[PDB]
Structure formats: structure tokens, C-alpha cells
Amino acid sequence: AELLTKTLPDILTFNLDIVIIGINPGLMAAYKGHHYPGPGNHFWKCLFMSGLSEVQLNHMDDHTLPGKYGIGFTNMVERTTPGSKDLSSKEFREGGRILVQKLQKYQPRIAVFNGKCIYEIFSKEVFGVKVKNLEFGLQPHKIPDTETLCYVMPSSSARCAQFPRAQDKVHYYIKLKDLRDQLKGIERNMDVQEVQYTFDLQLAQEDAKKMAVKEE
Amino acid sequence: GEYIKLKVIGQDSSEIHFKVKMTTHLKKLKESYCQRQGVPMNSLRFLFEGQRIADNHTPKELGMEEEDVIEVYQEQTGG
Ligand SMILES: [Cl-]
Ligand SMILES: [Cl-]
Ligand SMILES: [Cl-]
Ligand SMILES: [Mg+2]
Ligand SMILES: [Mg+2]
Ligand SMILES: [Mg+2]
Ligand SMILES: [Mg+2]
Ligand SMILES: [Mg+2]
Ligand code: NA
Known about the structure:
The complex is a heterodimer of chains A (about 220) and B (about 80).
Chain A: E1 18-22, H1 27-32, H2 43-49, H3 65-69, E2 71-75, H4 89-106, E3 110-114, H5 116-127, E4 137-138, E5 149-153, H6 170-183, E6 192-198, H7 201-213
Parallel strand pairs in A: 1-2, 1-3, 3-5
Antiparallel strand pairs in A: 4-5
Helix pairs in contact in A: 4-5
Chain B: E1 3-9, E2 15-21, H1 27-37, E3 44-48, E4 51-52, H2 59-62, E5 69-74
Parallel strand pairs in B: 1-5
Antiparallel strand pairs in B: 1-2, 3-4, 3-5
The structure holds chloride ion (CL) (3 copies), magnesium ion (5 copies) and sodium ion.
């Protein structure tokens, strides 16, 4: 089949702690049939760097996340296509209905929005609210008629301009892990707690470029 | 016990704030830092006002206080 007609099977089950939600399937993800295949994405690196996974995994391990990590995947819109930040209001709205339907069925503890962009779209087409001063992290609203929380993290795509490297985004994966543990009553080692991360944008871009040039 | 906020600054000017317990071995801090930065524990050295931080040093032992800065350097040349 031609790439734009392909879809990406989501990975959902009951009793999940986290569901990673993006706008729609990326080109490489749809092509390979796995969620967030790098190197143009920082998801898997951040997943390990934040301690959400025990070892460094890759897109071919996505199927193991529900069972071993209580993590699943899906997207706002199932249709594959670049420029998805500007899809029609009607397509987003319909995708939102389907997404909320799945969340109300599986009831994951936290709906994790991969980037402010997708959460902004979700709020507009589902809540009917243009969010003002959207902050990263936990949001005050839950998925319609459920106890599922909404958590917003920086986009994992390498295209994210605000955060050039995986390490510039991992802070929120760490905060997500801390929240997750709290919900499960998992003993949190309060000896050390990361509370803030700031960096120099330009040096980060240059660093990201260099590492990208080094062929392993 | 009591805790203090420490700022860990890297050579890329990244600055990472951590809330740390005064009586805990900084090994945890160094470990947390190395993992979140994606580098080996032996690839970095942590300094507090000229003093290299050992795994069994605690903020209280080093005389650290709120807002103190820890500087991190690589043990080897750029990646
Ligand atoms: Cl196509
Ligand atoms: Cl990958
Ligand atoms: Cl973002
Ligand atoms: Mg997803
Ligand atoms: Mg970060
Ligand atoms: Mg002590
Ligand atoms: Mg001791
Ligand atoms: Mg002093
Ligand atoms: Na040591």
C-alpha cells in the first residue's frame, strides 16, 4: 500500500497507567508499523533516560510496554500525513470523539499528550476550549466523564524547536514517572528530586547537530 | 530531615535543579544526573567550589546550602 493510506495499530489494554497520545501516525511510524521509530524522534531515548524503562528500548519493543511498563499508544487522528498540525477542524473533532471513546473504555490513569500542540487541539475540539497559558505537566481537566488525568510533555519529534535534544525534554518524562509512582503508591526516593531544567537553546541545537553527524 | 535546592551546571550551560536531602550520599544525585543526561557514571566529575564530590559525600559534610552550585565536567573530550 502507498504510505499515506497506511494506519498504525494502537497499543491499548485495560489497567494501563499511561497512554502516549500524538496527533497522528508519523511517516516512519506508519511505514514500519511501530510507534515512534527514531532517529527523528526522542521518545525511546527519553523513556530510558527518565527511568520509565529499565533498559534502552527501541520502536520494535513497543508491544512490550503495556505488559511490562503499563504504557500504551494511540493518536488523535488515525490517518497518516505530514502537516498534521493543521488538519481540518472536522477531522480533528471526529478523531477526538473516537479517542475519548477509547479512553472511556480502557480507562488509563494518565493520558499523556505528546506536545502542547496536540493538547491544544484536543482541548479545542473535545472540550470546546481554546486553552490559555498552557503549561507543561499536569492539567486540571480530566478526559470527559472519567478519572483519567491529562499530562502534557514536550513533543518527542526532533522537529520540536523549543527543545533540540532528548535531554532537553526528559525532565517531563521524569516528572511523569514521579506522578505515576505517586498514583500507584510506589515508594518515592525523596533523597533526590529534579525540580527544574533550563538550558541554552543555541548550544543545544549545535550539540544536537554534532551528535547527529557522528555516525555511531 | 531538611533539604536544600542545588543547581547542577554543565559545560553546555544546561542547569538542572535538584531538591536534595542534607544527610544523603550524593551518589544518588550523580547517578540521577548521569542517567537523565544519558551518559556513563564514569564519564563525569562533579565539583562543589573546587572540591570533587565523592559518592559518599553528603551536602551536610560539604557545607552545602540552599542555591549552591555544582559544576560538572567531562572526563574525556567531546563526544
Ligand atoms: Cl502516499
Ligand atoms: Cl527507535
Ligand atoms: Cl511541545
Ligand atoms: Mg502515540
Ligand atoms: Mg529536560
Ligand atoms: Mg551528613
Ligand atoms: Mg556515610
Ligand atoms: Mg557557602
Ligand atoms: Na566516588
